[PDB]
Structure formats: structure tokens, C-alpha cells
Amino acid sequence: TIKEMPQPKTFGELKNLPLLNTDKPVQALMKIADELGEIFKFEAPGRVTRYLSSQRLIKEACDESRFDKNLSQALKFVRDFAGDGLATSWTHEKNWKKAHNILLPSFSQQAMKGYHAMMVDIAVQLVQKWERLNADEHIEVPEDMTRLTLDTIGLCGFNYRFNSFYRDQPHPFITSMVRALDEAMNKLQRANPDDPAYDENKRQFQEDIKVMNDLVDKIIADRKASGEQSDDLLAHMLNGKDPETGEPLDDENIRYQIITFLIAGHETTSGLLSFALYFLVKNPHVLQKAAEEAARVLVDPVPSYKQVKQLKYVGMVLNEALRLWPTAPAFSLYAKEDTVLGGEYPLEKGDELMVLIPQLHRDKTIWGDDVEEFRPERFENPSAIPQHAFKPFGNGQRACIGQQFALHEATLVLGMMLKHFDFEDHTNYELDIKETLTLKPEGFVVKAKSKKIPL
Ligand code: HEM
Ligand SMILES: C=Cc1ccccc1
């Protein structure tokens, strides 16, 4: 029979809404889940969702015959500049399935072999930056990781160089994309959005949408004009046809895909590299085992695709960082039809669910009692992990299309970092996780002492 769902504290007619009026709402929801357990109701004026934390319930939420992707309010705000690109589209929009089918070959593990050389171009620029630091300078870790991931998406995707390692202030496009994301997220905690206080925000948002559209629309038009034949993401969208409908993407949807790759991939991936290096410096025995593998495998001056696939322990480090702090920490679902969740929670068609990934990844019934320890070896026998226990890239057809790109990039870069430098947590850095659409260890800094191995 039916179980009644717990609910966190309420604020009269505002219901639970003021609980998300905080700088770190994911971390606040994790503490609620510790207090209330695997499922709790969350109400706001005019809306409700149910937050899920256990593998037992999230295995069912991941059944695509019963639940489909919902656009969170954050994604609906991002949609104002990401349009109907893949991340901010409903599964029922025609341009979702058309873009999914056209793009999927461009994102496969096999496709990584053609992106590898340009990933090494940007990775070598990061290593050279660090080798050229003076004694006792330091590294700002998320900032350098983000320079790397943005430049790698831009080059590998569309043959465009942001030249982030040549700058203090980013390329105008980046400045506009970052200020537009930041406005979209700030709209989630704005009590009176038509107050004159926000006139300048409005004006600045429209200006940044035009900067992004103008740049990306020109890159697409320049490529079509030159007839330059390439195999990059832009090439495949200009050339590719959906096998189902037989149609290509139009130029406006190509622009939205390019903007989408930039915003979906830049901070997720740079957060994964930042959290990985954080956990290595805080666990020197794990750092040592990952550095030994990098030295044994990366025997040439430039890593090859085949070498990066042999950095097995580096891969487990990266999975263990995604376990503890998955950098896109939540995703939303709706019930396609009335159904019962977990034998005891009846749901009506349209009812929303939220998957709280960091909490899923702390389920002691899956991982055992040491869930807060950073132990990459927990990924040595991955066939033993039950279904839907480990969800940093989302679920099903609406899972991350960039997963192979992100992990090849992060394994290559973290392997080169461990081959080339010893690392010092010179400030005994205290973890402070800043939340935007993604998670970052804010202010994480290290010193890197060169092992003096040439490139
Ligand atoms: C470690 C890094 C990354 C993480 C943790 C991550 C995480 C996720 C998650 C959780 C989703 C599902 C969102 C939802 O259900 O609402 C998603 C979707 C998506 N991501 Fe990633 N992502 C990463 C890197 C990337 C990269 C590098 C790209 C592009 C190059 C990319 C492109 C996309 C796209 C286009 C979608 C929407 C796919 C669809 O719905 O068809 N991501 N990602
Ligand atoms: C479009 C932004 C985004 C960010 C994280 C995951 C998926 C998409």
C-alpha cells in the first residue's frame, strides 16, 4: 500500500522554495536527503518535484518506457540562448531526434581517434604554460582547466582558436557566453524580474545573445563559402543527413548545437579535471600510483590515442572523482503515464522527479561504508556494479553525447600532468564547492615542480 513522502521545512505560502535561496542549493539538498532519506517531496508556489537519492528508486526513474527528460527551470532559462540544441530540447521536438542521429557518429569512441591530435595541441599549450612558470609561482587550477576545455571544444569542433593561453581576459565570445550563463542562472532567484533594477541585465543579456549568434553564424557561413572539407563537428553537421527523415540540420539549429557544445562541455569537463587533481593531492598514495602509470605508459614526447586508452588507473581516478562530485549534479524527469514508483509511491502523468546524483553516488547499499573515501580501486570490477548505480553522464537516449570526448580529453590531460610535474598543495586548500549550472572547487591552487621531461 501507499507510503507518505517526507518533506523538508516550509515557509507558509512559499512552501519549500526559500530552501533553494542559497549559494549552494545542491549541497543543501544533499543535507536534506541525509536527514529524510531516499525520497522527499519539494513544493514551490505552482509546482512540485520529488528528489530521489537511492539506487533502488533511481533504477526505476531511469526506465525510459515510464519516464522521459524534463527541462528544469535552469535549462528553460539556458534555452533562451541555446535554443533547440540537443541539451535544451524536448525528446518530442523534431530537431532533437534529427540532431541526435546526425551527431552520434561524430561523438563515438572511434571518432576520438580523429580529434586526438588537436586535443594534444591544446594539452601541450597547458603543459608549456606550467613549465614556463618561475620558482614558487602557483597555478589557479579551475581557471587553467577551463582555458583548456574551452579551447579544446573550439578547435576540435569547429577549427576555431580562442587562444585562451594568450589572454588574461577571455575572447569576447567566451566573455558573452559566460555572462549569459551567469544571468540565466541568476534568474532562478529573482523575486521581481521586471523591477527596473534588472533593466541593465536585460539589455546585457540581449547583447550577449547577439555576440554569440553573430560569431557562430559567421563561422558557419565562412565554412559553407570556402567549401573547405573537413571531418570536424561543424563539417558533419554541414554534410550529414538524418537516416530517419532524410533531412539535414538547418543553419540556425547548427548554431545552437555549436553554442551547446561550448556551454555543456566546458565547465563539466574542467570541473572533473579540477576535482581529480584536488583528490590526488589530498591522497598522495593514489597520486603516486597514477603518476607511476603515466610514466610507464606515456613513453613518447606526444601521447598517442593507443597510449591514452592504456591509462587504466587514470580512468579509474576520473570515475572516482565523478562519483564523489559529478559536475552536472542533477537531472529532471517526468512520468509519461500514471505509474507506481518503487511499489509504494503512486505518480500521475506529468509528475516530476529529480535525480540527486552526488547522493545516489553515496548509497552505502551499493558502495559499502567507505563512501566518502577517494578509492579509485572501487572501479576495478565494473561488471559487479548494479544497474543505474553510477550516473554522472545522465540516462538513456538523453545521456551525455559528449561522454567519450570528455573522458578522452580528461585522461590525456591528467596523464600528461602526472608525467610532467610533481604537485604541492602549498596552501593546504580547504574544499569550497561553488555551484552554478555545474560544480567547481573554487580557489583551488597548487604548485607544480617540473620533472624536466621534454615535449
Ligand atoms: C565530464 C564532463 C561532462 C559531464 C559530467 C556531463 C554531464 C551530462 C549530463 C548529466 C547530461 C544529461 C542532462 C539532463 O538529463 O538534463 C548531459 C547531456 C549532454 N551533454 Fe554532457 N557532460 C560532460 C561533458 C560534455 C561535453 C564535453 C560535451 C560536448 C562536447 C557535452 C554535451 C552534451 C550534450 C549535447 C547533452 C544533451 C544530449 C541529448 O540530450 O541529446 N557534454 N551531460
Ligand atoms: C547546456 C548545459 C548543460 C550543462 C550540464 C549538463 C548538460 C547540459
Coordinates of C-alpha atoms and ligand atoms in Angstrom, one line a residue:
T1 CA 0.0 0.0 0.0
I2 CA 0.8 3.7 -0.4
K3 CA 3.6 5.4 1.6
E4 CA 3.6 9.1 2.5
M5 CA 6.6 11.0 1.4
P6 CA 8.7 13.1 3.8
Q7 CA 9.1 16.9 3.1
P8 CA 11.6 19.4 4.4
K9 CA 10.6 22.6 6.4
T10 CA 8.1 25.0 4.9
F11 CA 7.7 28.8 4.7
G12 CA 3.9 29.3 4.7
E13 CA 2.6 30.1 1.2
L14 CA 6.2 29.9 -0.2
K15 CA 6.2 26.2 0.7
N16 CA 9.8 24.9 0.3
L17 CA 11.0 27.5 -2.2
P18 CA 13.2 29.5 0.2
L19 CA 15.3 26.4 0.8
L20 CA 16.9 26.9 -2.7
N21 CA 17.5 30.6 -2.0
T22 CA 21.1 29.9 -1.0
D23 CA 24.5 30.0 -2.6
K24 CA 24.9 26.1 -2.6
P25 CA 21.5 24.6 -3.3
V26 CA 22.7 21.1 -4.4
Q27 CA 24.8 20.8 -1.2
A28 CA 21.7 22.0 0.8
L29 CA 19.6 19.3 -0.9
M30 CA 22.2 16.6 -0.1
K31 CA 21.9 17.5 3.6
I32 CA 18.1 17.3 3.3
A33 CA 18.5 13.9 1.7
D34 CA 20.8 12.7 4.6
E35 CA 18.0 13.8 7.1
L36 CA 15.0 12.5 5.1
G37 CA 16.3 9.5 3.1
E38 CA 15.8 8.2 -0.4
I39 CA 12.9 10.3 -1.5
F40 CA 11.4 13.6 -0.4
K41 CA 8.7 16.0 -1.8
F42 CA 9.7 19.6 -2.6
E43 CA 6.9 22.1 -3.3
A44 CA 7.1 25.7 -4.5
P45 CA 4.3 28.1 -5.5
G46 CA 2.6 26.5 -8.6
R47 CA 5.0 23.4 -8.8
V48 CA 6.2 20.2 -7.1
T49 CA 9.0 17.7 -7.7
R50 CA 10.3 14.6 -5.8
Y51 CA 14.0 14.3 -5.1
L52 CA 15.5 10.8 -5.4
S53 CA 18.7 9.5 -3.8
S54 CA 18.8 5.7 -3.8
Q55 CA 19.9 3.3 -6.5
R56 CA 16.6 1.3 -5.7
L57 CA 14.4 4.2 -6.9
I58 CA 16.7 5.8 -9.5
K59 CA 16.9 2.4 -11.4
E60 CA 13.1 2.8 -11.9
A61 CA 13.4 6.6 -12.7
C62 CA 15.8 5.5 -15.5
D63 CA 13.2 3.3 -17.2
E64 CA 12.6 5.1 -20.5
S65 CA 9.2 3.4 -21.1
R66 CA 7.9 5.2 -17.9
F67 CA 9.9 8.5 -17.6
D68 CA 11.4 10.9 -20.1
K69 CA 13.7 14.0 -19.7
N70 CA 12.1 17.2 -18.3
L71 CA 13.6 20.6 -18.8
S72 CA 14.5 22.0 -15.3
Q73 CA 13.9 25.8 -14.8
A74 CA 17.7 26.3 -15.3
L75 CA 17.5 24.6 -18.7
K76 CA 14.5 26.6 -19.7
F77 CA 16.5 29.8 -18.9
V78 CA 19.5 28.5 -20.8
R79 CA 17.2 27.7 -23.8
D80 CA 16.9 31.5 -24.4
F81 CA 20.4 31.3 -25.9
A82 CA 21.0 27.5 -26.5
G83 CA 17.6 27.2 -28.5
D84 CA 16.7 23.7 -29.6
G85 CA 20.2 22.4 -29.4
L86 CA 20.4 18.9 -28.0
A87 CA 20.6 19.6 -24.3
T88 CA 17.7 22.1 -24.1
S89 CA 15.3 20.3 -26.5
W90 CA 12.4 18.0 -25.5
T91 CA 12.7 14.4 -26.8
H92 CA 9.4 15.0 -28.8
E93 CA 10.8 18.0 -30.7
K94 CA 11.7 17.1 -34.3
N95 CA 15.1 18.7 -34.0
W96 CA 16.1 16.5 -31.0
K97 CA 16.0 13.2 -32.8
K98 CA 17.3 14.6 -36.1
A99 CA 20.4 16.2 -34.4
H100 CA 20.9 13.1 -32.2
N101 CA 21.0 10.8 -35.2
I102 CA 23.3 13.1 -37.3
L103 CA 25.7 13.8 -34.4
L104 CA 26.1 10.4 -32.7
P105 CA 28.8 9.1 -35.1
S106 CA 30.8 12.3 -34.5
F107 CA 31.0 11.5 -30.7
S108 CA 31.8 7.8 -30.7
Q109 CA 34.9 6.3 -29.1
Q110 CA 36.1 5.5 -32.7
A111 CA 35.7 9.3 -33.6
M112 CA 38.1 10.2 -30.7
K113 CA 40.9 8.9 -32.9
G114 CA 40.4 11.9 -35.3
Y115 CA 40.1 14.6 -32.6
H116 CA 43.2 13.3 -30.7
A117 CA 45.8 15.4 -32.5
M118 CA 44.0 18.7 -31.8
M119 CA 43.4 17.7 -28.2
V120 CA 47.2 17.2 -27.9
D121 CA 47.7 20.7 -29.4
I122 CA 45.9 22.4 -26.5
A123 CA 47.2 19.9 -23.8
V124 CA 50.8 20.8 -24.9
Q125 CA 49.9 24.5 -24.5
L126 CA 48.8 23.9 -20.9
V127 CA 52.0 21.9 -20.1
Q128 CA 54.2 24.6 -21.6
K129 CA 52.5 27.3 -19.6
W130 CA 53.3 25.4 -16.4
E131 CA 56.9 24.5 -17.4
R132 CA 57.4 28.3 -18.0
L133 CA 56.3 29.4 -14.5
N134 CA 59.0 30.9 -12.2
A135 CA 60.0 29.3 -8.9
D136 CA 57.3 29.5 -6.5
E137 CA 54.6 31.0 -8.8
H138 CA 51.5 28.9 -8.5
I139 CA 48.6 27.5 -10.6
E140 CA 44.9 28.5 -10.5
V141 CA 43.6 25.1 -11.3
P142 CA 39.9 25.5 -12.4
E143 CA 40.9 28.7 -14.4
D144 CA 43.6 26.8 -16.3
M145 CA 41.4 23.8 -16.8
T146 CA 38.6 25.9 -18.2
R147 CA 41.1 27.7 -20.7
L148 CA 42.0 24.1 -21.8
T149 CA 38.5 22.7 -22.2
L150 CA 37.0 25.7 -24.0
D151 CA 39.9 25.9 -26.4
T152 CA 39.8 22.1 -27.0
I153 CA 36.0 22.2 -27.9
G154 CA 36.5 25.2 -30.1
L155 CA 39.4 23.6 -32.0
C156 CA 38.3 20.0 -32.3
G157 CA 34.6 21.1 -33.0
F158 CA 35.0 23.9 -35.4
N159 CA 38.5 24.7 -36.1
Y160 CA 38.4 27.9 -34.1
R161 CA 41.2 29.1 -31.8
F162 CA 40.0 31.0 -28.7
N163 CA 43.7 31.4 -27.8
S164 CA 42.8 31.3 -24.1
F165 CA 46.5 30.7 -23.0
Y166 CA 47.4 34.1 -24.7
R167 CA 45.0 36.1 -22.5
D168 CA 44.0 37.5 -19.2
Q169 CA 40.5 38.5 -20.4
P170 CA 38.8 35.8 -22.5
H171 CA 37.9 36.1 -26.2
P172 CA 34.7 38.3 -26.5
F173 CA 32.6 35.2 -27.4
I174 CA 33.6 33.4 -24.1
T175 CA 33.0 36.6 -22.1
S176 CA 29.5 36.8 -23.6
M177 CA 28.7 33.1 -23.2
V178 CA 29.9 33.0 -19.6
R179 CA 27.9 36.3 -18.7
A180 CA 24.7 34.8 -20.5
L181 CA 25.0 31.5 -18.5
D182 CA 25.6 33.5 -15.3
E183 CA 22.3 35.7 -16.0
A184 CA 20.3 32.6 -16.8
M185 CA 21.3 31.0 -13.5
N186 CA 20.7 34.3 -11.5
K187 CA 17.1 34.4 -12.9
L188 CA 16.4 31.3 -10.7
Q189 CA 16.5 33.5 -7.5
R190 CA 14.8 36.8 -8.7
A191 CA 11.6 37.7 -6.9
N192 CA 10.6 40.7 -9.1
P193 CA 12.2 40.1 -12.6
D194 CA 10.5 43.3 -14.1
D195 CA 11.8 45.6 -11.4
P196 CA 13.9 48.4 -13.0
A197 CA 17.0 47.0 -11.1
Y198 CA 17.1 44.3 -13.9
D199 CA 16.8 46.7 -16.9
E200 CA 20.6 46.6 -17.4
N201 CA 20.6 42.7 -17.0
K202 CA 18.0 42.5 -19.8
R203 CA 20.0 44.8 -22.1
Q204 CA 23.3 43.0 -21.4
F205 CA 21.6 39.5 -22.0
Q206 CA 20.3 40.5 -25.4
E207 CA 23.8 42.0 -26.3
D208 CA 25.5 38.7 -25.3
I209 CA 23.0 36.6 -27.3
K210 CA 23.8 38.7 -30.4
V211 CA 27.6 38.3 -29.8
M212 CA 27.3 34.5 -29.7
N213 CA 24.9 34.3 -32.6
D214 CA 26.9 36.7 -34.7
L215 CA 30.3 34.9 -34.2
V216 CA 28.9 31.4 -34.7
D217 CA 26.7 32.3 -37.6
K218 CA 29.7 33.8 -39.4
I219 CA 31.9 30.7 -38.7
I220 CA 29.1 28.5 -40.3
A221 CA 28.8 30.9 -43.3
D222 CA 32.6 31.1 -43.8
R223 CA 32.8 27.3 -43.9
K224 CA 30.0 26.9 -46.3
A225 CA 31.5 29.5 -48.6
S226 CA 35.1 28.1 -48.7
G227 CA 33.9 24.6 -49.3
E228 CA 36.9 23.5 -47.0
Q229 CA 36.4 19.9 -46.5
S230 CA 37.0 18.7 -43.0
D231 CA 35.8 15.9 -40.7
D232 CA 35.1 18.2 -37.6
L233 CA 31.7 18.7 -35.8
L234 CA 30.8 21.6 -38.0
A235 CA 31.8 19.5 -41.2
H236 CA 29.5 16.7 -40.1
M237 CA 26.6 19.0 -39.4
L238 CA 27.0 20.7 -42.8
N239 CA 27.4 17.4 -44.7
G240 CA 25.2 14.9 -42.6
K241 CA 21.6 13.8 -43.2
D242 CA 19.4 12.1 -40.6
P243 CA 18.8 8.5 -41.8
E244 CA 15.2 8.6 -40.5
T245 CA 13.8 11.8 -42.0
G246 CA 16.5 12.1 -44.7
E247 CA 16.9 15.8 -43.7
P248 CA 20.0 17.8 -42.7
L249 CA 20.0 20.3 -39.8
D250 CA 19.4 23.9 -40.9
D251 CA 21.9 26.6 -40.2
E252 CA 20.1 28.0 -37.2
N253 CA 20.0 24.7 -35.4
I254 CA 23.7 24.1 -36.3
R255 CA 24.5 27.4 -34.5
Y256 CA 22.5 26.2 -31.4
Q257 CA 24.5 22.9 -31.4
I258 CA 27.8 24.8 -31.5
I259 CA 26.8 27.1 -28.6
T260 CA 25.5 23.9 -26.8
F261 CA 28.8 22.0 -27.1
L262 CA 30.6 25.0 -25.6
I263 CA 28.3 25.5 -22.6
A264 CA 27.6 21.8 -21.9
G265 CA 31.1 20.7 -22.1
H266 CA 33.3 23.5 -20.8
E267 CA 32.7 23.5 -17.1
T268 CA 31.7 19.9 -16.6
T269 CA 34.9 18.7 -18.0
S270 CA 37.1 21.4 -16.4
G271 CA 35.4 20.7 -13.1
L272 CA 36.2 17.0 -13.5
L273 CA 39.9 17.7 -14.1
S274 CA 39.9 20.2 -11.1
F275 CA 38.2 17.7 -8.7
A276 CA 40.5 14.9 -9.9
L277 CA 43.7 16.9 -9.2
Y278 CA 42.1 18.0 -5.8
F279 CA 41.6 14.4 -4.7
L280 CA 45.1 13.3 -5.9
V281 CA 46.9 16.0 -3.9
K282 CA 44.8 15.1 -0.8
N283 CA 45.6 11.3 -1.3
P284 CA 49.3 11.2 -2.0
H285 CA 49.4 7.3 -2.3
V286 CA 46.7 7.4 -5.1
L287 CA 48.7 10.3 -6.8
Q288 CA 51.8 8.2 -6.7
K289 CA 50.1 5.1 -8.3
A290 CA 48.6 7.3 -11.1
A291 CA 52.0 9.1 -11.7
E292 CA 53.7 5.6 -11.9
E293 CA 51.2 4.5 -14.6
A294 CA 51.6 7.8 -16.6
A295 CA 55.5 7.4 -16.6
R296 CA 55.2 3.7 -17.6
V297 CA 52.7 4.2 -20.4
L298 CA 53.5 7.8 -21.9
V299 CA 56.9 6.8 -23.4
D300 CA 56.9 9.3 -26.2
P301 CA 57.1 13.1 -26.3
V302 CA 53.5 13.4 -27.6
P303 CA 50.9 10.9 -26.3
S304 CA 49.1 8.7 -28.9
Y305 CA 45.4 7.6 -28.9
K306 CA 46.5 4.0 -28.1
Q307 CA 48.5 5.2 -25.1
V308 CA 45.7 7.2 -23.7
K309 CA 43.4 4.0 -23.8
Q310 CA 46.2 2.2 -21.6
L311 CA 45.9 4.8 -18.8
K312 CA 43.5 2.4 -17.0
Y313 CA 44.2 3.7 -13.4
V314 CA 43.9 7.3 -14.6
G315 CA 40.5 6.3 -15.9
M316 CA 39.5 4.9 -12.5
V317 CA 40.7 8.2 -10.8
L318 CA 38.4 10.2 -13.1
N319 CA 35.4 7.8 -12.4
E320 CA 36.0 8.1 -8.6
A321 CA 36.1 12.0 -8.9
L322 CA 32.8 11.8 -10.9
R323 CA 31.4 9.5 -8.1
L324 CA 32.0 12.0 -5.4
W325 CA 31.4 15.3 -7.2
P326 CA 29.6 14.7 -10.5
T327 CA 30.0 18.1 -12.2
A328 CA 26.4 18.2 -13.7
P329 CA 24.9 17.1 -10.4
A330 CA 21.1 16.7 -11.1
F331 CA 18.8 15.9 -13.9
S332 CA 15.0 16.1 -14.1
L333 CA 12.4 13.6 -15.4
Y334 CA 8.6 13.4 -15.9
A335 CA 6.2 10.5 -15.7
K336 CA 4.9 9.6 -19.2
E337 CA 1.8 8.0 -17.7
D338 CA 0.3 7.3 -14.3
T339 CA 2.6 4.7 -12.6
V340 CA 3.8 3.5 -9.2
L341 CA 7.4 4.1 -8.2
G342 CA 9.2 1.5 -6.1
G343 CA 6.0 -0.4 -5.2
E344 CA 4.8 2.4 -2.8
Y345 CA 4.8 5.9 -4.4
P346 CA 1.9 6.5 -6.9
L347 CA 2.6 9.1 -9.6
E348 CA 0.3 10.9 -12.1
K349 CA 1.2 11.5 -15.8
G350 CA 3.3 14.7 -15.8
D351 CA 4.7 14.3 -12.3
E352 CA 8.4 15.5 -12.0
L353 CA 11.3 13.7 -10.4
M354 CA 14.8 15.0 -9.7
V355 CA 17.9 12.6 -9.6
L356 CA 20.3 13.9 -7.0
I357 CA 23.5 12.3 -8.4
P358 CA 26.0 13.1 -5.6
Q359 CA 23.6 11.4 -3.2
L360 CA 23.0 8.4 -5.5
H361 CA 26.8 8.0 -5.6
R362 CA 26.9 7.8 -1.7
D363 CA 24.3 4.9 -1.5
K364 CA 26.0 2.6 1.1
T365 CA 23.9 -0.4 -0.1
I366 CA 25.9 -0.2 -3.4
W367 CA 29.3 1.1 -2.4
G368 CA 29.7 0.0 1.2
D369 CA 30.5 2.1 4.2
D370 CA 33.6 4.0 3.0
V371 CA 31.6 6.1 0.5
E372 CA 33.4 9.3 1.4
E373 CA 36.9 7.9 0.8
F374 CA 38.6 8.6 -2.5
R375 CA 39.5 5.0 -3.6
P376 CA 39.8 4.5 -7.5
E377 CA 40.2 0.7 -7.0
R378 CA 36.4 0.5 -6.3
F379 CA 36.1 0.7 -10.1
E380 CA 38.4 -2.5 -10.8
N381 CA 35.5 -4.9 -11.3
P382 CA 32.8 -2.8 -13.1
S383 CA 30.6 -5.7 -14.1
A384 CA 29.7 -6.0 -10.4
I385 CA 28.1 -2.5 -10.2
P386 CA 24.3 -2.9 -10.2
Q387 CA 22.3 -1.1 -13.0
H388 CA 21.9 2.6 -12.7
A389 CA 24.2 3.0 -9.6
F390 CA 26.6 5.4 -11.4
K391 CA 25.0 8.2 -13.4
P392 CA 27.4 11.1 -13.9
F393 CA 26.5 11.3 -17.7
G394 CA 22.7 11.0 -17.2
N395 CA 20.5 8.4 -18.6
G396 CA 19.4 6.5 -21.8
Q397 CA 18.9 8.3 -25.1
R398 CA 19.1 11.6 -23.3
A399 CA 22.5 10.7 -21.7
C400 CA 25.6 13.0 -22.4
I401 CA 26.6 12.8 -26.1
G402 CA 30.0 14.2 -25.2
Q403 CA 31.0 11.4 -22.7
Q404 CA 33.7 9.9 -24.9
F405 CA 35.1 13.3 -25.8
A406 CA 35.2 14.5 -22.1
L407 CA 36.8 11.3 -20.9
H408 CA 39.4 11.2 -23.7
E409 CA 40.3 14.8 -23.1
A410 CA 40.5 14.4 -19.3
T411 CA 42.5 11.1 -19.4
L412 CA 45.0 12.6 -22.0
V413 CA 45.5 15.9 -19.9
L414 CA 45.6 14.3 -16.5
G415 CA 48.1 11.7 -17.8
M416 CA 50.4 14.5 -19.3
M417 CA 50.1 16.5 -16.0
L418 CA 51.2 13.4 -13.9
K419 CA 54.0 12.6 -16.3
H420 CA 55.5 16.1 -16.3
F421 CA 55.1 17.6 -12.8
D422 CA 55.2 16.9 -9.1
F423 CA 52.4 18.7 -7.3
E424 CA 52.2 20.6 -3.9
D425 CA 49.1 21.5 -2.0
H426 CA 51.1 24.6 -0.8
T427 CA 48.0 26.3 0.9
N428 CA 46.5 23.1 2.5
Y429 CA 43.5 24.1 0.4
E430 CA 40.0 23.8 2.1
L431 CA 37.4 22.4 -0.3
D432 CA 34.8 25.1 -1.2
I433 CA 32.4 23.9 -3.9
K434 CA 30.9 26.8 -5.9
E435 CA 27.6 26.0 -7.7
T436 CA 26.4 27.4 -11.0
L437 CA 24.8 25.1 -13.6
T438 CA 27.9 22.9 -12.6
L439 CA 30.3 22.3 -9.6
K440 CA 33.8 23.6 -9.2
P441 CA 36.4 23.6 -6.3
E442 CA 36.6 27.4 -6.1
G443 CA 40.0 28.9 -5.4
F444 CA 41.9 25.5 -5.7
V445 CA 45.6 26.3 -6.3
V446 CA 48.8 24.1 -6.4
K447 CA 52.5 24.5 -7.1
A448 CA 53.9 22.2 -9.9
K449 CA 57.6 21.4 -9.9
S450 CA 58.8 20.2 -13.3
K451 CA 60.3 16.5 -13.7
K452 CA 62.1 18.3 -16.7
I453 CA 60.9 15.8 -19.3
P454 CA 60.9 17.3 -22.8
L455 CA 57.8 17.5 -25.2
Ligands
HEM1 C1 32.9 15.3 -17.5 C2 32.1 16.1 -18.3 C3 30.6 16.0 -18.5 C4 29.6 15.7 -17.7 C5 29.7 15.3 -16.3 C6 28.4 15.8 -18.5 C7 27.1 15.5 -18.0 C8 25.9 15.5 -18.7 C9 24.6 15.1 -18.2 C10 24.4 14.7 -16.7 C11 23.8 15.2 -19.2 C12 22.2 14.9 -19.1 C13 21.4 16.2 -18.7 C14 19.9 16.0 -18.4 O1 19.5 14.9 -18.4 O2 19.3 17.1 -18.3 C15 24.4 15.7 -20.4 C16 23.9 16.0 -21.6 C17 24.5 16.5 -22.7 N1 25.9 16.8 -22.7 FE1 27.4 16.3 -21.3 N2 28.7 16.3 -19.7 C18 30.1 16.4 -19.8 C19 30.7 16.8 -21.0 C20 30.2 17.2 -22.2 C21 30.9 17.6 -23.4 C22 32.4 17.7 -23.5 C23 30.0 17.8 -24.4 C24 30.2 18.3 -25.8 C25 31.4 18.2 -26.4 C26 28.7 17.5 -23.9 C27 27.5 17.7 -24.5 C28 26.2 17.3 -24.0 C29 25.0 17.4 -24.8 C30 24.9 17.9 -26.2 C31 24.0 16.8 -24.0 C32 22.5 16.6 -24.4 C33 22.4 15.2 -25.1 C34 20.9 14.9 -25.5 O3 20.1 15.2 -24.7 O4 20.7 14.5 -26.7 N3 28.9 17.2 -22.6 N4 25.8 15.8 -20.0
LIG2 C1 23.6 23.0 -21.7 C2 24.3 22.9 -20.4 C3 24.4 21.7 -19.7 C4 25.3 21.6 -18.6 C5 25.5 20.3 -17.9 C6 24.9 19.2 -18.5 C7 24.2 19.3 -19.6 C8 23.9 20.5 -20.3

